[PDB]
């Protein structure tokens, strides 16, 4: 119909700003509550970076979009686009912005042995 669909919510300014499918952060339409229907981008960089993740979530499977707690932007020396999506079961999945949808698309089928020699 009209206007984009909120596929995520950015937790900033002590509020949960509704993020559209195109990563259009509605800082003016924030809410004092976290929507369990979608992920919550906590402590995220400029909207320009958020738009990237949103692009991935806008194409990724709605199944994973629903299953999540909060997305934290944690860049690494080798992956500046390294994000961390929390799971409803208290799990922690680290995915990249370039392949966020793919990384989560594999769910349930993620977490390999490529996270032992980096901690």
From Swiss-Prot:
Role this protein plays: Cell division protein that may be involved in stabilizing or promoting the assembly of the division complex.
Subcellular location, record wording: Cell membrane
Range covered out of full length: 117 to 233 of 261
Domain comment (free text): The extracellular region contains three distinct subdomains: a membrane proximal alpha domain, a central beta domain and a C-terminal gamma domain. The alpha domain might serve as a chaperone that stabilizes FtsL. The gamma domain is required for interaction with other divisomal proteins. The beta domain might modulate protein-protein interactions of the flanking alpha and gamma domains.
Superkingdom of origin: Bacteria
Name of the protein: Cell division protein DivIB
Region (Beta), start-end ranges: 4-116
Family listed: Belongs to the FtsQ/DivIB family. DivIB subfamily.
């Amino acid at each position: 119909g009209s206007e984009w669909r909120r596929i995520a919510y950015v937790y900033d300014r002590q509020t949960f700003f509704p993020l559209l499918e195109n990563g259009r952060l509605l800082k003016q339409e924030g809410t004092k509550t976290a929507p369990s229907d979608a992920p919550v981008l906590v402590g995220w960089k400029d909207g320009d970076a958020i738009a990237e993740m949103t692009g991935q979530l806008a194409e990724l499977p709605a199944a994973v979009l629903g299953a999540m707690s909060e997305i934290h932007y944690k860049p690494t020396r080798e992956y500046e686009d390294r994000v961390i999506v929390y799971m409803n079961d208290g799990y922690e999945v680290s995915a990249t912005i370039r392949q966020f949808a793919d990384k989560l698309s594999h769910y349930p089928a993620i977490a390999a042995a490529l996270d032992r020699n980096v901690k």
